[PDB]
Amino acid sequence: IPKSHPRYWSLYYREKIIEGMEKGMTAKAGLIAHGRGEAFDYLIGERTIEPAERAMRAAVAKFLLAEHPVISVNGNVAALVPKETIELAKALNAKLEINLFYRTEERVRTIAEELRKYDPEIEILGINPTKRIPGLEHERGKVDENGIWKADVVLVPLEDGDRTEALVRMGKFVVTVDLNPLSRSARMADITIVDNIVRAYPRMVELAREMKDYSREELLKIVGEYDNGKTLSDVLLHIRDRLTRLAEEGIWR
Amino acid sequence: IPKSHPRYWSLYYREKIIEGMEKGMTAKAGLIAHGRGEAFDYLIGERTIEPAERAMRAAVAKFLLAEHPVISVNGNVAALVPKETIELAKALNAKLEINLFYRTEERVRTIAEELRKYDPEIEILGINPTKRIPGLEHERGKVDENGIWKADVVLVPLEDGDRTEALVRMGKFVVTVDLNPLSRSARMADITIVDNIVRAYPRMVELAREMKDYSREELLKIVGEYDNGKTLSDVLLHIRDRLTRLAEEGIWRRKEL
Numbered sequence: 001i002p003k004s005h006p007r008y009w010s011l012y013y014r015e016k017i018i019e020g021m022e023k024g025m026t027a028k029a030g031l032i033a034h035g036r037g038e039a040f041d042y043l044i045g046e047r048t049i050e051p052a053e054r055a056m057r058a059a060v061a062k063f064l065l066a067e068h069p070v071i072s073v074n075g076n077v078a079a080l081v082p083k084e085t086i087e088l089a090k091a092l093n094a095k096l097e098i099n100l101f102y103r104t105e106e107r108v109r110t111i112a113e114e115l116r117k118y119d120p121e122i123e124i125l126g127i128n129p130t131k132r133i134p135g136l137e138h139e140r141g142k143v144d145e146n147g148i149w150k151a152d153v154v155l156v157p158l159e160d161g162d163r164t165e166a167l168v169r170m171g172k173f174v175v176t177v178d179l180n181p182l183s184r185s186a187r188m189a190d191i192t193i194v195d196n197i198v199r200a201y202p203r204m205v206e207l208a209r210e211m212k213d214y215s216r217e218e219l220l221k222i223v224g225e226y227d228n229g230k231t232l233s234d235v236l237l238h239i240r241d242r243l244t245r246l247a248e249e250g251i252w253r
Numbered sequence: 254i255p256k257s258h259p260r261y262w263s264l265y266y267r268e269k270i271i272e273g274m275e276k277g278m279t280a281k282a283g284l285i286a287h288g289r290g291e292a293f294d295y296l297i298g299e300r301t302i303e304p305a306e307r308a309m310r311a312a313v314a315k316f317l318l319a320e321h322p323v324i325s326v327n328g329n330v331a332a333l334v335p336k337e338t339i340e341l342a343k344a345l346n347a348k349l350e351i352n353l354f355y356r357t358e359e360r361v362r363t364i365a366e367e368l369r370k371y372d373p374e375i376e377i378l379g380i381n382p383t384k385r386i387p388g389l390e391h392e393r394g395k396v397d398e399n400g401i402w403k404a405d406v407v408l409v410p411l412e413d414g415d416r417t418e419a420l421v422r423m424g425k426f427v428v429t430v431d432l433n434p435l436s437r438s439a440r441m442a443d444i445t446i447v448d449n450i451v452r453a454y455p456r457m458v459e460l461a462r463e464m465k466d467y468s469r470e471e472l473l474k475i476v477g478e479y480d481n482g483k484t485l486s487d488v489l490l491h492i493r494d495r496l497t498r499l500a501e502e503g504i505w506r507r508k509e510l
C-alpha cells in the first residue's frame with residue numbers, strides 16, 4: 001500500500017506480528033491480543049495521548065528511583081519492539097527478563113535470539129527461571145531470581161490480568177503498557193500507559209534522557225503526585241469524545 | 254479453563270477460534286479480527302444490549318418475509334458457532350454458503366466437514382463459487398450462483414466493508430453481525446446487529462422459532478419501522494454513557510464493572 005494509506009502503520013505492524021508467529025516467537029493467542037490492540041489504538045487515535053504521556057513520565061521517574069528495575073519481555077514485544085525494549089532497559093538501567101505465560105523452549109530461545117539480533121551482548125534473564133510468582137500455576141508464573149523475583153519496580157507490557165494482579169499482591173510495583181484501559185491488567189497495575197507499545201517504548205526512552213538528571217526530590221514529586229485512577233478515567237473520557245467525533249465522519253447511507 | 258475464572262467466557266472463545274485455525278478452518282487474520290471484535294465487546298459490556306435485540310428482531314422478520322434468503326459462513330463463524338449457524342439457516346429456510354476472504358481448497362473442505370459434524374446431509378454452497386461480484390478482488394469476490402448470486406436477503410457476519418458494500422450495490426438486502434458500530438460493514442448493511450456472534454446467533458435462532466408464526470402483518474410492521482441509522486447511534490449512545498459512568502465512578506483496582 002502507498003505510504004499515504006491511512007492504515008499504513010497498523011498494516012506494517014500486523015505483518016510484523018505475523019512474522020513473529022512465523023519465527024516461533026508470538027503465540028496464537030498473541031495474534032488475537034494484537035487485534036485487540038489495533039482496535040483500541042484506532043479508538044484513541046494511533047498517537048500517544050496526554051494521559052499516556054502523563055503515565056509515561058511517572059513510570060520513567062519511578063524506574064530511575066527504583067532499586068532493582070526489571071523490564072519484562074513476551075512474544076508480542078519481541079515481534080514489535082525488540083530493539084526498543086533493549087534501549088529502554090539501558091536508558092533505565094533495568095535488567096531484561098523474558099517472561100512468558102505460555103512458556104516453551106523454542107519460544108524463549110527465539111525471543112532470546114531476536115533480542116540479540118540487536119545487541120549480541122545484553123544480559124537476558126529468564127532463560128531458566130527458578131522462582132515462582134505466588135498465586136499462579138507453576139508453568140505460568142516462572143521468574144528468575146535475579147530479575148522479577150528480586151525486583152521492586154516491574155514493567156510487564158501487554159500482560160495478562162492474573163499475572164499483573166499476582167505481581168501486585170506479591171508486593172511489586174507494577175507498570176504496564178496496555179491499549180485496553182478496561183482490561184484487568186490495565187486496572188490493576190500501579191501505572192498504566194494506554195498507548196501502542198510501538199510509540200511508548202521510544203517515548204519513554206526519550207523521557208529517560210530528558211529526565212536523566214533530575215533532583216531525586218523532583219523524581220519523587222512526579223511519582224508522588226501521579227494518579228493512575230485519574231489517568232484511566234481521562235483515557236476512558238478521551239475514547240468517548242473520539243467516539244462522538246468519529247461517528248460524525250466517514251462514508252454513510 | 255476453570256469455569257470459576259472471571260474471564261472464562263472470553264478465554265473459552267479465544268480457545269475455540271484458535272482451535273479453528275489449527276483445524277484449518279480459520280485464517281491467521283481471522284484471529285486478529287476476533288481480537289478486534291473483543292475490543293468493541295469490552296466497550297459494550299460483553300452482552301446483548303437493547304439496540305442489538307432490536308436489530309435482530311428486524312433481521313429475523315426480514316428473513317422470514319424473504320423468498321431467497323442466504324446465510325454466509327466464513328472461518329470465524331465456522332469455529333465459533335458451527336451449530337447455531339446451521340440451526341438458524343433451517344429455522345429461516347435459508348441456504349448456507351461458505352465465503353472466505355482468504356479462500357483455499359483445504360479451508361473450504363474443513364469448514365465443510367465441520368458443519369457436517371452437526372448435520373451429515375446439510376446442503377452447502379460456495380464450495381466452488383463461479384459468479385464474480387463486480388468491483389471486487391477476483392480473489393475475494395466470487396459467490397455461488399445458486400446462493401448469494403440470486404439471493405434477495407443475505408446475512409454476512411464478521412464481514413469486510415468491501416464485500417458488504419458490493420453486495421448492497423448488487424441490490425441485495427444485507428444483514429450483518431458486527432461488534433464495531435463504526436465499521437464500514439456496519440454502515441453499509443441494511444440491518445446491523447452490533448453484538449457478539451456467539452450471543453447473537455443463538456438468540457436469533459430463538460426469534461426465528463418464536464416468530465415463525467408472527468402474522469405477515471406484524472412482521473412487515475417490524476421490518477418497516479426499523480431504522481439502522483437510529484439503531485447505530487443508539488449503540489454509540491449506550492457506549493458513550495457507559496464510558497461516562499465508568500469514568501466518573503473510577504475503575505482503578507476495581508474488580509467488577
Ligand SMILES: Nc1ncnc2c1ncn2[C@@H]1O[C@H](COP(=O)(O)OP(=O)(O)OP(=O)(O)O)[C@@H](O)[C@H]1O
Nearest residue numbers: 033034037158160161178179180183184185196197
Ligand atoms: N501492540 C500492542 N500495544 C499495546 N497494547 C497491546 C498491544 N497488543 C495487545 N495489547 C494489550 O494487551 C492485552 C492483550 O493481553 P490479554 O489477552 O491478557 O488481554 P485481556 O485478557 O483482554 O486483558 P486481561 O488479561 O487484563 O483481562 C490487551 O488487553 C491489549 O490492551
Ligand SMILES: Nc1ncnc2c1ncn2[C@@H]1O[C@H](COP(=O)(O)OP(=O)(O)OP(=O)(O)O)[C@@H](O)[C@H]1O
Nearest residue numbers: 286287290411413414431432433436437438449450
Ligand atoms: N466474535 C465476533 N462477534 C461479533 N463481531 C465480530 C467478531 N469478530 C469480529 N467481529 C466484527 O467483524 C469485523 C471483522 O472484519 P474486519 O475487522 O476485517 O473489518 P474492519 O476493517 O475492522 O471494519 P470494516 O472493514 O467494516 O471497516 C470487525 O469489525 C468486528 O466488529
Ligand SMILES: [Mg+2]
Nearest residue numbers: 159160161162
Ligand atoms: Mg488475558
